[PDB]
Ligand SMILES: NCCOc1ccc(-c2cn(-c3cccc(C(=O)O)c3C(=O)O)nn2)cc1
Ligand SMILES: [Zn+2]
């Protein structure tokens with residue numbers, strides 16, 4: 036069964052195989068006095084591994100590199116932060132330390148720099164205007180417009196029909212907004228319907244935090260964000 040939050044110390048990283056060559060990584064952090072899940076993706080790319088997002092901080096992420104090798108034994112050579120928050124770039128430092136080439140939209144690097152969060156080295160051109168999509172190794176990267184953050188990207192694995200929406204998508208257990216400090220609440224339902232239009236194929240849908248679902252995660256997220264909008 037996919038892991039739930041209370042099973043994972045603030046330091047233990049679980050790997051959850053989602054298909055041949057596709058895993059998710061699951062870590063936990065403390066924030067607001069409380070303890071939260073966080074998902075990221077691992078995609079095999081021939082001989083190497085593409086990482087999507089950090090494990091939320093340098094400790095967790097050095098740890099996350101150590102499951103992968105222990106459990107998968109393939110080198111992580113590239114990594115993508117899907118937006119500028121710490122649960123995504125927390126431990127880019129680390130990854131670069133180990134030789135991982137880090138990447139991020141130019142929108143994400145600038146807002147990370149403005150924010151005092153770590154900065155991916157490379158820039159992921161071709162993702163600026165809403166609807167922009169580019170190909171990155173075994174997956175597709177999509178910029179659905181402002182939502183959870185103005186920079187958020189979302190990731191699609193054709194090979195297994197996995198759609199990783201990160202923090203732009205909520206799990207079903209999550210009924211209420213939670214951190215929208217950097218959200219474009221007006222655009223978020225829209226930015227999201229695109230994700231629906233441009234990836235109807237997706238059987239597995241991972242959110243930034245919590246239990247994967249199918250595409251009803253999207254409609255649930257819109258419901259949450261709209262509810263939130265009206266107070
Ligand atoms: N001095 C201004 C502070 O600026 C900050 C902005 C954002 C964050 C931050 C929220 N994180 C989250 C923690 C729990 C849940 C979530 C979520 O996806 O809903 C997030 C988040 O990514 O917003 N991660 N990092 C932390 C600090
Ligand atoms: Zn965020």
Ligand SMILES: [Zn+2]
Pocket residue numbers: 120122202243244
């Ligand atoms: Zn998040």
